[PDB]
Design an enzyme around this catalytic site. Structure first.
Site, PDB file in Angstrom:
ATOM      1  CG  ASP A   9      -1.790   0.218   1.048  1.00 44.64           C
ATOM      2  OD1 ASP A   9      -2.243   1.543   0.317  1.00 44.64           O
ATOM      3  OD2 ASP A   9      -3.115  -0.146   1.100  1.00 44.64           O
ATOM      4  CB  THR A  10       2.212   3.834  -2.215  1.00 46.29           C
ATOM      5  OG1 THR A  10       1.895   3.410  -3.483  1.00 46.29           O
ATOM      6  CG2 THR A  10       3.421   2.782  -3.182  1.00 46.29           C
ATOM      7  N   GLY A  11      -0.490   4.658  -0.086  1.00 50.47           N
ATOM      8  CA  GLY A  11      -1.029   5.675   0.058  1.00 50.47           C
ATOM      9  C   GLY A  11      -1.737   4.861   1.531  1.00 50.47           C
TER      10      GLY A  11
HETATM   11  C1  IM1 Z   1      -3.023   3.852   7.711  1.00 46.69           C
HETATM   12  C2  IM1 Z   1      -3.926   4.056   6.512  1.00 46.69           C
HETATM   13  C3  IM1 Z   1      -5.500   2.982   6.366  1.00 46.69           C
HETATM   14  C4  IM1 Z   1      -4.237   5.078   5.691  1.00 46.69           C
HETATM   15  N1  IM1 Z   1      -4.699   5.198   4.371  1.00 46.69           N
HETATM   16  C5  IM1 Z   1      -5.563   5.267   3.627  1.00 46.69           C
HETATM   17  O1  IM1 Z   1      -7.254   4.216   4.300  1.00 46.69           O
HETATM   18  C6  IM1 Z   1      -5.099   5.057   1.964  1.00 46.69           C
HETATM   19  C7  IM1 Z   1      -6.153   6.749   1.685  1.00 46.69           C
HETATM   20  C8  IM1 Z   1      -5.547   7.565   2.082  1.00 46.69           C
HETATM   21  C9  IM1 Z   1      -4.991   8.208   2.527  1.00 46.69           C
HETATM   22  C10 IM1 Z   1      -4.020   9.393   3.227  1.00 46.69           C
HETATM   23  C11 IM1 Z   1      -5.230  10.209   4.120  1.00 46.69           C
HETATM   24  C12 IM1 Z   1      -6.813   9.731   4.047  1.00 46.69           C
HETATM   25  C13 IM1 Z   1      -6.798   8.553   3.516  1.00 46.69           C
HETATM   26  C14 IM1 Z   1      -6.335   4.770   1.130  1.00 46.69           C
HETATM   27  C15 IM1 Z   1      -5.658   2.978   1.237  1.00 46.69           C
HETATM   28  O2  IM1 Z   1      -4.867   2.668   0.280  1.00 46.69           O
HETATM   29  C16 IM1 Z   1      -7.233   1.823   1.399  1.00 46.69           C
HETATM   30  C17 IM1 Z   1      -6.767   0.287   1.509  1.00 46.69           C
HETATM   31  C18 IM1 Z   1      -7.910  -0.662   1.142  1.00 46.69           C
HETATM   32  C19 IM1 Z   1      -7.752  -1.034   0.059  1.00 46.69           C
HETATM   33  C20 IM1 Z   1      -8.950  -2.088   0.582  1.00 46.69           C
HETATM   34  C21 IM1 Z   1      -9.799  -1.657   1.079  1.00 46.69           C
HETATM   35  C22 IM1 Z   1     -10.694  -1.393   1.860  1.00 46.69           C
HETATM   36  C23 IM1 Z   1      -8.921  -0.637   2.149  1.00 46.69           C
HETATM   37  N2  IM1 Z   1      -8.327   2.022   0.195  1.00 46.69           N
HETATM   38  C24 IM1 Z   1      -8.856   2.350  -0.488  1.00 46.69           C
HETATM   39  O3  IM1 Z   1      -9.502   3.270   1.218  1.00 46.69           O
HETATM   40  O4  IM1 Z   1      -9.563   2.547  -1.197  1.00 46.69           O
HETATM   41  C25 IM1 Z   1     -10.085   3.656  -2.033  1.00 46.69           C
HETATM   42  C26 IM1 Z   1     -10.680   3.066  -3.064  1.00 46.69           C
HETATM   43  C27 IM1 Z   1     -11.392   4.689  -1.461  1.00 46.69           C
HETATM   44  C28 IM1 Z   1      -8.919   5.184  -2.189  1.00 46.69           C
HETATM   45  C29 IM1 Z   1      -2.963   6.443   6.366  1.00 46.69           C
HETATM   46  N3  IM1 Z   1      -2.609   6.930   5.498  1.00 46.69           N
HETATM   47  C30 IM1 Z   1      -2.641   8.098   6.093  1.00 46.69           C
HETATM   48  C31 IM1 Z   1      -3.694   8.545   6.911  1.00 46.69           C
HETATM   49  N4  IM1 Z   1      -4.157   7.295   7.120  1.00 46.69           N
END
Ligand code: IM1
EC number: 3.4.23.16
Lengths: 99, 99
Positions: free
Chosen positions: A25-27
């Site tokens: 997961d890069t995000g």
């Molecule tokens: C710790 C992680 C879980 C969290 N990141 C995410 O949830 C990121 C997005 C984000 C980045 C930064 C701030 C808010 C949201 C999303 C992940 O890529 C998640 C992982 C996942 C995959 C499959 C099902 C459920 C979850 N993907 C996701 O939310 O799906 C969509 C399509 C909506 C982006 C995060 N990174 C930084 C702050 N919070």
């Protein structure tokens, strides 16, 4: 290995005696895994993603073998739909995004 | 380029007349942008992420320039904390994960 993104980037990880499948997961800034039995004392934390905030347990100093590579980091355990390996460990296995 | 994950992978995008910064996210199946001003018909859809499900409006065949790469796909607009470039658009500009 080089991974294309036509499918979800899933790899096998071994954590506290258990074998699991998880998303590179890069995000995600953090690594969050579904509930499991991990040893040690942990701290209460809360994190947010799409949909809002979940309450999680943080464990520091945990060892994970990712797609067979060892690394030690903070792993957050708690109510996630998929196991997520975020940037705190991805940089330890030398992962890069290339285009 | 080659992006190492020591910081969040943010890239500048051009979507319908406007300039935005977005995260390159391999854990996202879809591209979700924050409430914007897009021309057209859009359709409702609900997506789940770690803290739950959100209602977004869906756009198809929207042109996006991600770092000088023009690509065309479905863009979801809604209440996301950050703009996300997910795998449905990452594969078009040839982006891989590597370690
Ligand atoms: C710790 C992680 C879980 C969290 N990141 C995410 O949830 C990121 C997005 C984000 C980045 C930064 C701030 C808010 C949201 C999303 C992940 O890529 C998640 C992982 C996942 C995959 C499959 C099902 C459920 C979850 N993907 C996701 O939310 O799906 C969509 C399509 C909506 C982006 C995060 N990174 C930084 C702050 N919070």
């Amino acid at each position: 290995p080089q991974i294309t993104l036509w499918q979800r980037p899933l790899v096998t990880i071994k954590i506290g005696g258990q074998l699991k499948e998880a998303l590179l997961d890069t995000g995600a800034d953090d690594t969050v895994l579904e509930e499991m039995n991990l040893p040690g004392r942990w701290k209460p934390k809360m994190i947010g993603g799409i949909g809002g905030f979940i309450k999680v347990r943080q464990y520091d100093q945990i060892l994970i073998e990712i797609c067979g590579h060892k690394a030690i980091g903070t792993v957050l355990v708690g109510p996630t739909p998929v196991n997520i390996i975020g940037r705190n460990l991805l940089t330890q296995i030398g992962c890069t995004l290339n285009f």
